[PDB]
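Exercise 7. Predict the joint structure of the components listed below.
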Amino acid sequence: LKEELHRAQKELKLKDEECERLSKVREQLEQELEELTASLFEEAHKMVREANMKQAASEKQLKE
Amino acid sequence: KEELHRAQKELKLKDEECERLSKVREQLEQELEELTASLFEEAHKMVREANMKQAASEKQLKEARGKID
Amino acid sequence: DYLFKLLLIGDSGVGKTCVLFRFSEDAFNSTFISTIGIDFKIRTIELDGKRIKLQIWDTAGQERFRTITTAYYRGAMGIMLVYDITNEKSFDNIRNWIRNIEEHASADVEKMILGNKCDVNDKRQVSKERGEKLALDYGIKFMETSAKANINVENAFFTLARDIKAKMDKK
Ligand SMILES: Nc1nc2c(ncn2[C@@H]2O[C@H](COP(=O)(O)OP(=O)(O)O)[C@@H](O)[C@H]2O)c(=O)[nH]1
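Solution:
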């Protein structure tokens, strides 16, 4: 009769701890994504500031 | 059966959570893909502008270097 | 020799991004915060001799990148909460945002409230006093600022970074 609860709880332990594991990896996944997206933006920015300073350079040659 | 009455609840819940966590794998790269795609577009639109206003700006340093020389 | 990962959050149109660009001393207005809702900037500073790299994420709360923006909350060492003193619900919400920080971010993270646009007193709706009480209740630091006039931006970051470092040299 009680056997159903007996299983249910054994089942809760397994799911509780698989859940813990699963979270350690969400943590990594996120650090990696940060580091990657970080550098993505870094570049996008660097690359834009080049195109603009290029325009500025011959902007000033033209006012002189 | 008071214990089970509600014991099954966190089991449903804990489980429902594990499910959501596994999704977290692909849900990251799914978003990443989009974000990357976007930057590409947006940073381009940007560099496009700079180029058009640099290049048009370039041909009058020859036209005005030509109005002098 | 140190790398601090920082995050700026709060309601939209609060000034979060100008706050950033000011501190990052970028000579341009050019951002992706409008068309993406994320932006990123670095600055290295000296704190008691040492070089400190600061990595500042600017998020804008769009569900389009919910999952990614958590990655920023989860990995952030210091997170500035920003409201606009010209606007109440920005301030009212500062609790809501604290819920998130508490809920999405780490247990010991360093926090700081930044009542922004202080420079404009004529349209002020949120008293400074009321702002420092908010802060003291939650037991975190508070600081009024102005991205445009350049008031206390730099002091805010240096301040936050000192709190971070001091916490780390303890361990
Ligand atoms: N008076 C004043 N206006 C500001 C200040 N900071 C930002 N703004 C203006 O507020 C508007 C939106 O600010 P923004 O940085 O986009 O807020 P975000 O969306 O949270 O980054 C723009 O018109 C900014 O120029 C400030 O310190 N003082």
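Discussion. The domain at 1-64 of chain A is CATH 1.20.5.4880 (Single alpha-helices involved in coiled-coils or other helix-helix interfaces).
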